Write a protein that binds this ligand. Sequence first.
Ligand SMILES: [Cu+2]
Ligand SMILES: [Cu+2]
Ligand code: NA
Ligand code: NA
Lengths: 620, 620
Amino acid sequence: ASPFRLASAGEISEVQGILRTAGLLGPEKRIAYLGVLDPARGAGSEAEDRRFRVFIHDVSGARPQEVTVSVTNGTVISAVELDTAATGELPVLEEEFEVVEQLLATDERWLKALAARNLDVSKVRVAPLSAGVFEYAEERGRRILRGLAFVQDFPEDSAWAHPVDGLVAYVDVVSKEVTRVIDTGVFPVPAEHGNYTDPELTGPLRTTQKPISITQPEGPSFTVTGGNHIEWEKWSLDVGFDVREGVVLHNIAFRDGDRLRPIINRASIAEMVVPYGDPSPIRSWQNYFDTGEYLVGQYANSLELGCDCLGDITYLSPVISDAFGNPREIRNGICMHEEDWGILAKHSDLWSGINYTRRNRRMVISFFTTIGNYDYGFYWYLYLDGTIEFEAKATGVVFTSAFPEGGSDNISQLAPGLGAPFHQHIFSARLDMAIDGFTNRVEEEDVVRQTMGPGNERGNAFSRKRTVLTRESEAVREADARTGRTWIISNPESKNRLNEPVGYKLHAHNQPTLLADPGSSIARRAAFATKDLWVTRYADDERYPTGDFVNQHSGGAGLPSYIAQDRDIDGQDIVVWHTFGLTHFPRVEDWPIMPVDTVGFKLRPEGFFDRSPVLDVPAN
Amino acid sequence: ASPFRLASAGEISEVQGILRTAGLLGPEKRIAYLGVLDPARGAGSEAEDRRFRVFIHDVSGARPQEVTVSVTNGTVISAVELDTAATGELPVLEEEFEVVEQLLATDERWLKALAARNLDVSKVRVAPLSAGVFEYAEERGRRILRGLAFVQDFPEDSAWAHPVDGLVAYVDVVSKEVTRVIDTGVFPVPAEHGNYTDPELTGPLRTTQKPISITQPEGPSFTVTGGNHIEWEKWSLDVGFDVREGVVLHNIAFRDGDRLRPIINRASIAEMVVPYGDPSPIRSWQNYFDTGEYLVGQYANSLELGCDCLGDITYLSPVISDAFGNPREIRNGICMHEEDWGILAKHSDLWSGINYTRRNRRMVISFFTTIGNYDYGFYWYLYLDGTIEFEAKATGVVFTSAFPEGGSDNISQLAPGLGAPFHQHIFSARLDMAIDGFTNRVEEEDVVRQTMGPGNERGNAFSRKRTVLTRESEAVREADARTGRTWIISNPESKNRLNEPVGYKLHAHNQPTLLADPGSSIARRAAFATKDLWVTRYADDERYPTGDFVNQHSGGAGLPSYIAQDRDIDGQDIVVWHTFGLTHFPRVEDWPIMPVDTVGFKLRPEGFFDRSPVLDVPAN
Ligand SMILES: [Cu+2]
Ligand SMILES: [Cu+2]
Ligand code: NA
Ligand code: NA
């Protein structure tokens, strides 16, 4: 019944049928993206209309299309031909990944480079990586992938332990031609294996860990209705899934007494970029847009009970489309459970004699994706006290290179001859805010130090200041950890009982933003990553901080173009875009498989409630 | 057996007997501090010699003494008379706190002030607070507490809801004299109650929370031997307890194959200061040194199973001395347990076909203390992957004032007429480092941005730089979150298999440091709090960043005086002092009892191991 329900297999089958009969899904066609559209802004919107947006690739070389279809009515709403030299290429297709290694295997330049290194071509794996936009004029308007080589000594070997440095190839995956093979010189291929299940490397497994049993004898405290609507400890929300963004949270609201109060209309990780900082021409082009170029939802893992998700787990199994429009279920792709979270509030009062302790809990919604060597967990947390938090967990295998004999300023050494280039992992959270409704504004809050003097004779005073961001041209902000900078999203038309506007405070981790030179290709294409906070006026078609078609787009799309409209954001329907990331100088302990590291952000109530919202939590 | 064992009731009783026999503990004497001294440097040294340090107060006004006793040999090692106007007063005695309200109840100036406000003296509670050092020359050499008043409407009422603003009194607790009563004018006493167990305020309690059961069917994975020696998942350490510092961790080491490798010799929270930022003369003197002035271990809570500590809990019950030298047990004062901690490492490899997931866990050592309205939890965590982390949890009831009718730049409004002054909670962690032994150095690591140009033609490269801190005069450092600044503690004489020095990296939260004007009394007394990181050469008598005697002590002791020695710290026995804290602008949601907020730091291995140290964790 809900317009925010997960897409079903039947809906995807109907989209396939509509496209086929319209002549848009012949045998040369591939679906590169398919997803449901959110309802347009309408508090009186009643008529059910489920619409899907589709990107259609053509393997014969014809122009791709963007298509919108109504599943409810069985109609094509619009279909537009794309000029990819102008607006960007379509996301990378899973089936194009295999093409790179196969094409190189019969290319004479590639074979000569391998023969010089005495490598068997049947043992050489090629990582197919996005191309970006650099100096090669012949690439404009063509779908290019670049390939880096790794040796697999046997079928179960970790090829990441054996990079083939000094070699890179560029491939046109539509015309199926190898455009360039660059061989800058022979580097020894690192010889140690990195097989983390080999007993020779692990040694004897520990026998010291005793079980931790986490159970809910009465079942969980949350309810799931209509497939994806969650109610838990005054929270209300809908859990969506999109093949590009992954888990999306809709309609986050909090039931305060008799009233359901909105907080966030839509929360997602709208882009994720992994830029590499090695100036070698073998890798200086390397930048993954995992969300925009690869689509993180389509590589979501099936999560196994007792290993990936521990406790009383409720699973969702989202459905996506394959390249031909058939539905594909991601079994157990989303874990939902509640977790104990220590002490919530505690006080032992001498004067009253009352001893008071209460425990905290959080609701966890998570999924895990795998893109080549890296694995990322995406965690959303809801706490009893109104806090909302996101956490990304990075693990997997680090991307490797040779370690040059005379050291390096841009690569760390992991093992003899084995390097790991410096890189970042930078996320963009898109928060379509709805603090008590859609009339919102953002204030920047800094600590203010005060000088000893009149009115501050002991030199102890300190204060704070708030600056309203009133237009998009002034809403591109930088962190300042030294002054305790945070941002408050408030509703100027909704006051608490003290006659102050209700609000929520965003607490950032204040990690470094994009390090690349401001003139670089990556700084132009990932402009969102150069600043910590952006605020835009809501618009239906401003979905991603990098634009709709990220692959091989020349730059400037997304947030810089949106902000240029300079719209009023002072008491309006606004969107907060928060950049946050990890700067990774790999350490020896990251090899041969990396222990999890984390980064995130949180939002806490700031005068949203009239007092603590957890006074009604029992002692239990 | 072990020289690091917890003090026993018998040892404390024996110290009492030795002091009495020596003529140092007659009826006029009180023990203000008693604690065990750590062994001096020297592997083995005196086979068994348990020494105790005692601060002895005299209620008749005679000079106090610092005494060191050998309980093993039954001897006083040294006893020195203290000149407190020079070197500082002893810590506040529990029995002195109750003196203040009783003395004020018979003072005509106090009674006149309450009569002007129509307040019944029998309902007025007085919070007795440390005095600091300000402009009052008569206080030099005297033990002073300052009192702020709160109304308690009935015996179970939360007095914190009803501050009596405009009124403060100063009390000499030895001579039992009220030195000054200051009345700057009548403020309305806020009338709303703050009784968080009153059903009128809580509403009906939630019935929605289903139980979470955490059990360990085979018991915990750690062993406790010798009373306080812990072995867990390759970690080895001793859990100490000191009445001033609270939980102290000794001899933190990691079993790497056959070798027990030291990491940290001694870790503690060696001071904590809570400065208030309200320039009202009623509160502009207000600064708590909870560790140095009050002694946080003295006020440790007894922790209740299932409420405070959940799971399979092992308790320690440390013994402290009362003011007369009798042993007092803090029953269940320390909780120890292991916790599941999510995914440790995970990778699904396309080329090898191997899917791999492992789970993390942490060992938790915690205690909670209550000082007046505030309650603080101290948590130490050890993780499977070698990470060490500390977390402070702040809760309790915020300190209140009137909210002035025209508003305030230094006070938040919590309820009608009720304010909460701005303040900070700042901690100093003292880490006596021993990375693979005692020859250590500290490097400051910054990210380095690189300009597009020759050798970086695409403008993507970035790097890092490390700067060795070689002498104490250059080892007073500030955070820089924008450049990703961290500090590495390494052993230049112990190399990993890649011939790089082993190390650990300190990751700070980069919160603001002390905000007070640098000329203020609090900036001089809490100089440690003005900088994020200090490194000193180890010395036996350099224990606290504020010196031995903090109460009513001006500047002149502590870290600024230690650093002046300008000792060599490049490959020497060194101590890291890290300042970290919360800046608290109270919100409505903090009232009437505050949900937990947190701050901390962590240390992660940085080439300490030759590869990931958790390859031998089983799948389960
Ligand atoms: Cu990384
Ligand atoms: Cu506070
Ligand atoms: Na909005
Ligand atoms: Na040391």
